[PDB]
């Protein structure tokens, strides 16, 4: 199964899901797993042997995941009888992504500056 | 000319090709068909001496 | 101006129904006792209505069962203002063939020259 | 166009339920008394019912012990434009299963080609 | 049947589709399927024999369409008398695609650098 | 005639349309049949021969219809009673297009680099 | 009569014209059917002799009167209380006219390419 | 009398006038027939040999009358009793003009390339 | 010519390549080659005295 488990984006969001974000968040995880997993090909072995490298990837998963589901259904605001609350502001085209930040905790960065470099065949 | 400009229309030029940058290689290539002929400078690279 | 449009009873505009109108005249009674009502002869034109009366304690009124089945309707009702004959609380209108009583006298509105209008309420009970 | 979406009584929108609706009809009594109540035949439709704003004097009137369970429901009704038929005070709808009493005439409103439509209260009781 | 399901695009919407919601899930996912196969016509066979790939090519076609199936009847808000909602800035009228960082994790890449060659016939 | 019917528009609207809906999409199907037709010579020979293509076709057909009658009439809210509702802020839909990367599925494609060739007639 | 009938544009139109609108439609049908036989004088004997020429004019005098009849009063919003819609903030329907890509349709292509020529009057 | 008459505008504007707007309409339509005729001094003769040439000035009276006549009195909104409309905002200030697609339907053209030309007097 | 392109429609080119900076690079080598071989310096540049 998963490195990380529904306990831990449960653990991060501070609210209990529902049977479906369950399944959801279960779907997400395995994802979020392998996207790093095509990125460190090594990611289980390091995580079978490496405590604090392990700990990292359990919550660089669990907060790619949570970016996504913190509000999935889209609200701005509902109203209830007499109650109603609005929320701040949110991009509307959520995907899941691991940040450049995130892919330098597991180990692996861009350079921003790369060379293109002229040739020609040489003669004989 | 007087014209309606109701795009905020304007005039263009492509530029002429000026024909002395080819005048520049056939001078080298007269100085290069004269030394390796050996002809008195004149008879080829007649912008000479 | 919506106060002046309508049209004429033989082709209303859009929101107007074509109507008789019958407006009042006093008739005295067998003991000399002066009454109003309606007069025996109706002017042809066209009227806006709209629903009134959906106050609570006037809503539960619509349908009864006590002595016979009663209702009562409410609507309020305009002429455009080329019709400059007034109806008087006695006066009467045919609308959709049914008969409504003109009900109080009318509503005056004057704020200014172009503003200017009458407003009726109908009732049928 | 809320008005005129609603459907047909085997697969409606979502915001319409299907009814049978039995229209109008006149009976004589035992003595000659004209009465009016539901036709025997009810016409298949779809319906858009929304609750009624009940409220103080008529809010505690919900439910009742002084002479048997007796409650009171309202609710307005509509019917898309499609069905031409017209319901009047003492004819009836059967919704949801039960049957409910249409509530005084239906109230017209006119105001222009595309707004115009009749809205319907009912009532169990 | 198509590679993904409407239990795929059900799993990550996290609710109940109707039977009307169904019918269009089965069409786009059959769309997104197509689509993905006529840029990549190894597709099924790699699918059938590596389980790794197949995930990828499930979860894309699933997110494919869950993009384009939320909130496709376009309500920004909608009330009653006692309980109302109103919905973030999504994109209205919107299309089905394939985005560039889900290509790349199915195989397929492109350059954002190409040559115009100028040629001239040879003389004969 | 149309490979496309009122059912494929239906299946991708979600809706079911009434039947002053039905009349409008028979003839903006065979507007868009037409359309195509008149670009691909050879569309309802090789839509015969070729099962991927006619399914791309009458995909490509219900969604060039799709996009023209969702919202026809286009309202932005309605209330009724007291429900209310209001749409995302939609382009106002008024013409039936094939957009480019439609086309290009068709198999025709829009070359974005032509060149302007000077002439002179030679002497005699 | 013209070519196309009112129970063409009241076809692509989802609504039904009263009596007074149907003259409306006629007196719109009678103007695009002049600009189309003068800008191809032909067309009488194109769509008598050609059926799919016959239906690419039929419906271009369609959507050209559709264009102006649809919402021709100029409301933006109405209500009585009880109801009440808005609608999208179009454009004004100003003046009847035929689009470039329709034009594209009867072969009348034109060239946004044009050259100014100098002239000069040779001596005797 | 006039060439278009008050039921041209009429059936182009689909309101029946009322005994005021009839009065101006006829004013409207002479203003119309001069503006005209000042521009194509020929007009009623050539109007009096082509049938089409008339339907195309009586359609040009009476849609360039048509323009002034549509919410003469200026409203955006007006409310009575539940009832209330409002108008898609349109221009202030119209006064009667024919456009230049109009003139070019009536033959008529103006060039956008004028030349300024040196003169100077030639001694003697 | 005359277009209907505008929002933002231009004509623009890129320049020639001077072919004179590749001739000042054949008299540098024509130096050299007079240098190496000790020629008379008319023999290569026969534009010089």
Do not use: C
Not at chain 3, 36 to 64: D, H, K, N, Y
Not at chain 3, 66 to 84: A, C, H, K, N
């Amino acid at each position: 199964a998963t490195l990380a488990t529904h306990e831990d984006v449960t653990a991060f969001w501070a609210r209990t899901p529902t049977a479906e974000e369950i399944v959801l968040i279960n779907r997400r995880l395995a994802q979020a797993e392998r996207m790093l997993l095509r990125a460190i090909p090594e990611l289980l072995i390091k995580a079978s042997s490496d405590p604090v490298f392990r700990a990292e990837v359990i919550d660089i998963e669990a907060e790619a995941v949570l970016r996504l589901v913190r509000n999935h259904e889209g609200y701005l605001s509902e109203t209830d009888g007499n109650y109603t609350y609005m929320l701040q502001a949110q991009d509307p085209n959520r995907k899941l992504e691991i940040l450049p930040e995130e892919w330098e905790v597991l180990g692996i960065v861009r350079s921003g500056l790369g060379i293109l470099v002229p040739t020609v065949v040489l003669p004989s | 000319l007087a014209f309606e400009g109701g795009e905020g229309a304007h005039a263009e030029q492509f530029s002429a090709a000026e024909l002395r940058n080819f005048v520049d290689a056939l001078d080298a290539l007269d100085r290069k068909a004269a030394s390796y002929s050996g002809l008195p400078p004149q008879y080829l690279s007649s912008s000479s001496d | 101006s919506l106060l002046d449009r309508g049209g004429t009873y033989g082709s209303p505009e859009d929101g107007f129904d074509p109507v008789t109108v019958y407006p009042e005249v006093t008739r005295k009674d067998r003991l000399g006792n002066t009454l109003v009502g309606p007069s025996l002869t109706g002017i042809e034109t066209v009227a806006r209505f709209q629903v009134q009366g959906q106050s609570g304690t006037s809503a539960r009124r619509a349908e009864m069962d006590d002595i016979g089945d009663m209702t009562e309707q409410v609507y309020t009702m305009r002429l455009p203002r080329s019709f400059t004959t007034e109806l008087k609380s006695g006066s009467e209108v045919v609308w959709r063939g049914e008969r409504w009583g003109v009900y109080g006298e009318p509503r005056r509105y004057k704020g200014s020259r172009r503003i200017a209008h009458l407003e009726y309420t109908v009732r049928r009970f």
